[PDB]
Symmetry: D3
Subunit: 260 residues, 6 copies
């Protein structure tokens, strides 16, 4: 069984599902807890986003959430605080295989994101596999030779500039998905973080169509179910449909109010 | 403003509301996190139960949850793992003023629970108020003289033995409320922790009525809203109407299912 | 896949292996770290002992070690600090199914250990399965009805008194295995925690044989490999053959010495 | 009350006091503990500086110190390790509203500090308010529209270069205060971190006068009471008068020595 | 140097100083922080009391405080939450050699405290020295044979019952010192934790004299310096003269007040 | 003794041993635990590398590992995640005196590493010694004047570019040692992280010879003992001969396999 476990651990199931065009339904994790992460790992989502940008996470809390999530069918995705090669290196060594990189503005930045995930000559990933949960402390055989192909890089387009540079970003080898962040986008477009305006919606839907056309996976986070279904219909392949903090806050609030 | 903060830290608002016959709507906290505790402190509940019996909490995590909840209107209640004077002492020194004591079987045990919370001569509470958050490290004036009166002891009746001893338990001075645990009770009655059986409901209803007629506050945890309203109708004064882990688990499950 | 994950979370593989007379090779975990626990879960042991008696562990660190170990074939066993029903309750709710109970002196104490692990009417286990990782927050169907049968209670015999009471201890229903602690035993016999004396070895051998003849599983911790094989030869079924702190300390020492 | 709490939480009282020219007396927090932070929150200071530059703090320990301090009249100020937009973003999302930015050398850097705190179009603050304690997980109404005006940016001038560029820094919109760091300044001036030299004192006092003249708030940390009063007389508006580690170390040392 | 480090780790310097009649000046540690413990270990105290009774400490935080204090001349003493053999065992295995045991009421209880600290046949201390920091994971040679003699047991007398039993308590072999808790004592005597009353002072003075005449070490905690010197004058040998939380709280308060 | 402790703490024994040409045998610490660090501090190594680049460490876990290691003869060395002046500043303030800086490509970068460790005018180290464990909260006398000379900067050459720039790096004042990272080097040379190729070995041995020739200390990490002895023979002065995670994983694996 250990052998079975290790020859099984390497494979990036999320990446494989995106390549095959299987839509993946996700939940955002901002509770920054390995305990609630495990609870939510059993809810039935295809993927769970561990947010190191907008939730108080770091490399150490990412590690314990990956450990919590590990035995479940739900697949972890991790958002670094920015497109930082050092931070990406550290997240990969604790076992991150799927990265959601915020604020990717152009093809150079997208390329930098991809190269941060890959060992030389294909990138600049630093080698420390004996030390790393990524290789299970060198129990995964041929880890150094197998690692690059199982990395999944998803880049966020969150500004008008990023939207303008989209065709070039879609040309970058190793960018597997492009995620539209509606809150940051509408803010950049002058709608103060509220995406429910026709101009923001048009830019979002056009982008999803262009992304899918290139053969890459479109992604988005949207709490409105009707909009989520509509993005799915247009070809989005990684769609986060809620946020743990929001689910908890709204369920508790609605419950308290039912009792006055 | 510091004088003003301290001369109001002392006051037990939950105990005052129970004495006045104001019904208090509660949420159970099993997430064991100061982060989600603060989030839930903003939802509008009268009280929040920090569970040290059935959730992975200790004195240390109780402390950080009390700190998180402090500026909000919601009032903290703490459940020790058992009727243990040592643990009760430690919970009180970190600032706990309202205790929900599990598995109180008779009047002697209820009396022991009360005495654990009170300084001599009215009890056996150990003195270390310079060290303790309870007195805000001695910034609350005359803490040793004001502490006993602001302690609020709630005892759980969870077995047929406990239900038989209810009249005597209710005669114990310092027992402010009596809480029925329907799952433990139904388990003891032969229904395996499933309270939705006529015999269990009848015992619960009779106990609520009996508690309230003796001038004490009846308490209960119940996830079913219609049962909750019925118990409120009957005179229950501290009613927890959901559990954070359950709210979170069920909302995430339903969300995932809506997308298949 | 979630249904499939849950309908297999319930099953105690260690208990099943012991019942079938399959010898189980174990490693003791005193490092008190979810990080090294995961590392050691990949090494190939049948079972890992999370020590809450002689290592700085608590319910909280047990929980994170269980999460770390979960996806691996190695099965977790937990040692509480003593035969304490409250601590046992808390360990079970975080997901512990196999307990190694220290200093069990007689059949009454063995019976108390068994009853602490079982829901009424077969025991006194407190009910809080909505809150607990044990039921995966109620995602395991019919948890309350399936829990008792998957509990595996191992009792330590560590004194001459305990050895005398062995026949009666072995007659206790629910005692699945009997573990001999050679250090505590030799200490009680007047050999100061050093088990390598003929009189101690003879008592150990006789107990192993006696345990196995009664149809129960004999257990032991032994760092000496040849003694371990001998005890296996004699019928021992759960044998811990080293301790993580010792493995680490001795390998580092020998390495340093090779370089002067 | 929840409504009252939220419509009350948004307001930056420290910023309002500085605009009104009310001098604010502060204590530096380097103990990196939510426990001692709460203790010191009751001491009567107008503000408390949570030091992420010279004390072992990070985003997570800042969060728990803010939670500890929250119910007290003392107002939190947070120093990031440097003028880092990513780190500033993370500190703001956990609820930081007043920032003390070290090593601001010129007006460009001061402008970058200001823009890191503001949502587009006024800055580059990333939007993730559903996830954030800053908005109380979206319970503060109109958070996105109200947030920019409640941010308070204080910049540190700590070198001869910064002193030379002071007139231009004072022209930067959104810089509410300018803090002189005497230890770093004297070091840059060739006095090895000791500010008690006439040339350092002259540069400090001249700067305080120039700062106040521009209508912005001068600030400083000084352990000497006589110098503190003298800086206050010259118009300094945010003056930290001690450091928790120093208060503790000196009180304990003086106590031990009194007993030989 | 490792041999040299280990052959000096074993020795209890506090116990040796008490036996020689050298007065030891102490500081109480309620901050529950390994960081402030190290800071205070440099202040010049003979001993530091890590409080597990009235401060939010556990075995885990005791361990990190012992590690922090280790390289300094100040000697650690640990107070368990009560006279509990299980907790005492766990405290000893993490390296505690000097215990201050609260609420010892009679000679039987004093004897139980002593026996909890000693390996058979002189006591009931459980054997797990390979796992324990106490033996430095077996690097201290002949640990099992040297441990008992380096244990130092101090018992608190805190009630009128305890004062009556003092002669018998003092006849217990292994009781190295007797500590009077003036707050608990005055509370029991009817003075509500306020020891500054003639009757309480007289009982304290008489006990100090009685303890010292029996050849044992008298101990006390007292924040008032002149009372401390008086008790020293009378023969007290372990005298804690302040509390870290109090030192910190009072220095910060006085500082704030000097600035209004 | 406090005086003795402080006037003793300042001295960098590792730096002194390198200047005197005493070879130093090391162990890498990737377990990221203050507990196992203390265990390994007693194993007999001259130095221990706390890895903040490839192990999940941060400033806070470095701090607790330094505290754990402090009383032992083994000397701590710390690797930051990169040549980052802010991170270096924070590591120095918690007490790091010996730094191993990864990915130093040229003499400019080496100079930046050196200047990050030194107070003005010799570098850009920020001054906050009252707050810092580095000065023992200002108990080390003349800390500001003594600190620069006790800093020990070791730079890693890990690419073909770094190897080409070696002569210039060796000319940089304050670079005390040059460490070859074989895994990163062979990766850069096209051998995918496996250093056991003649071309990698030749580049390594030539570099060691050039380093020692310049009068600076060569260093390396190598798990093969025969290669370690061979690098030592050529003049390497800081040689790490194993990794804690590897020692633990391989000892546990070999043990499990001996029992089938
Ligand atoms: Mg965004
Ligand atoms: Mg119950
Ligand atoms: Mg034993
Ligand atoms: Mg400065
Ligand atoms: Mg006392
Ligand atoms: Mg490297």
């Amino acid at each position: 069984t250990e052998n079975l476990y290790f020859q099984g651990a390497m494979e990036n199931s999320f990446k494989a599902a995106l390549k095959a065009g299987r839509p993946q339904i996700g939940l955002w994790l901002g509770l920054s807890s390995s305990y609630s992460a495990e609870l939510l790992a059993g809810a039935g989502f295809d993927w769970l986003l561990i947010d190191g940008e907008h939730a108080p996470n770091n490399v150490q809390t990412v590690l314990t959430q990956l450990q919590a999530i590990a035995p479940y069918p739900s697949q972890p995705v991790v958002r670094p605080s920015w497109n930082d090669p050092v931070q990406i290196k550290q997240l990969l060594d604790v076992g991150t295989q799927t990265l959601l990189v915020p604020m990717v503005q152009n093809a150079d930045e997208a390329r930098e994101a991809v190269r941060a995930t890959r060992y030389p000559p294909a990138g600049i990933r630093g080698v420390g596999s004996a030390l790393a949960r990524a290789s299970r402390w060198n129990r995964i055989p041929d880890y150094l030779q197998k690692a690059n192909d199982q990395m999944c890089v998803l880049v966020q387009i969150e500004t008008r500039e990023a939207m303008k540079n989209l065709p070039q970003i879609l040309d970058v080898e190793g960018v597997d998905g492009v995620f539209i962040g509606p809150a940051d986008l509408s803010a950049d477009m002058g709608y103060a973080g509220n995406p429910q305006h026709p101009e923001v919606q048009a830019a979002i839907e056009q982008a999803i169509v262009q992304i899918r056309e290139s053969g890459k996976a479109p992604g988005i986070l949207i709490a409105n179910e009707q909009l989520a279904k509509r993005y799915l219909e247009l070809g989005a392949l990684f769609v986060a449909v809620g946020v743990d903090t929001t689910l908890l806050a709204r369920a508790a609030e609605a419950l308290a109010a039912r009792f006055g």
